[PDB]
């Protein structure tokens, strides 16, 4: 549509720098997180490092993974017309969630995902309400790991966007599982050629690690995201 200005999926054919900034308030504990790295949508790959820039993170790092850039999913060639996330770029989209932790509190998140220059930027405000002081979150009882999940995507025609409902399973240190029910909405910031997809899902795998030379509270993240569910 413009051979002289890359738009939509054309912005993601190579390796793209990423900046993430989150400011959070959980039960009145206010904190900030900054992440940086790169995305390789051709391979569905994210490599990021996140630092809590205010001190110790008052919630477990795994509980923030889904909040801390689905435009880097690898959509198969026969599914490219269903990629809402890239089609909104560079102007971007708003991603909102409520995440309810079973038998504990909830997060509300609002984020803008858009290009700032050559960098894909995810800026987030997070509010956490009703957490138990001796629960798995404020008590830091969740294992430092992450399971693989599927997130089913459906069009939200009235808002020209998409929705998603899915449950994250967080391993607890006692061998139990802590469910985190995600209600997600995405709406474009602009109004260009936005693609409203047929039903499909995103398959996601994550690996968490530590940087042995990093003094600050932090999370190193490798993540893969791949679209599926429509037949060739």
UniProtKB/TrEMBL annotation:
Transmembrane segments: none annotated. The keyword Lipid metabolism does not apply. Gene3D superfamilies: Green fluorescent protein. It comes from the Eukaryota. GO terms for biological process: bioluminescence; generation of precursor metabolites and energy. The keyword ATP-binding does not apply. InterPro entries: GFP, GFP-related, Green_fluorescent_prot. Keywords: Chromophore, Luminescence, Photoprotein. Belongs to the GFP family. This is Green fluorescent protein. It comes from Aequorea victoria (Water jellyfish).
């Amino acid at each position: 549509k413009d051979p002289m200005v890359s738009k939509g999926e054309e912005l993601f054919t190579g390796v793209v720098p990423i900046l993430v900034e989150l400011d959070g308030d959980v039960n009145g504990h206010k904190f900030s997180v900054r992440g940086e790295g790169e995305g390789d949508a051709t391979n569905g790959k994210l490599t990021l490092k996140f630092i809590c820039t205010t001190g110790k993170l008052p919630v477990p790092w795994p509980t923030l993974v889904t909040t801390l850039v689905l435009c880097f999913a690898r959509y198969p060639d026969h599914m490219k017309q269903h990629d809402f996330f890239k089609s909104a770029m560079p102007e971007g989209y708003v991603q909102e969630r409520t995440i309810s932790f079973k038998d504990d509190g909830y997060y509300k998140t609002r984020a803008e995902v858009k290009f700032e220059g050559d960098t894909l930027v995810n800026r987030i405000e997070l509010k956490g309400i009703d957490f138990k002081e001796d629960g798995n979150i404020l008590g830091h009882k969740l294992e430092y790991n992450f399971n693989s999940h599927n997130a089913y995507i459906t069009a939200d025609k009235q808002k020209n966007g998409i929705k998603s409902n899915f449950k994250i399973r967080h391993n607890v240190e006692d061998g139990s599982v802590q469910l985190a029910d995600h209600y997600q909405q995405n709406t474009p910031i602009g109004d260009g050629p936005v693609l409203l997809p047929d039903n499909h899902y995103l398959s996601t795998q994550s690996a968490l690690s530590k940087d042995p030379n990093e003094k600050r509270d932090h999370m190193v993240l490798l993540e893969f995201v791949t679209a599926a569910g429509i037949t060739l």
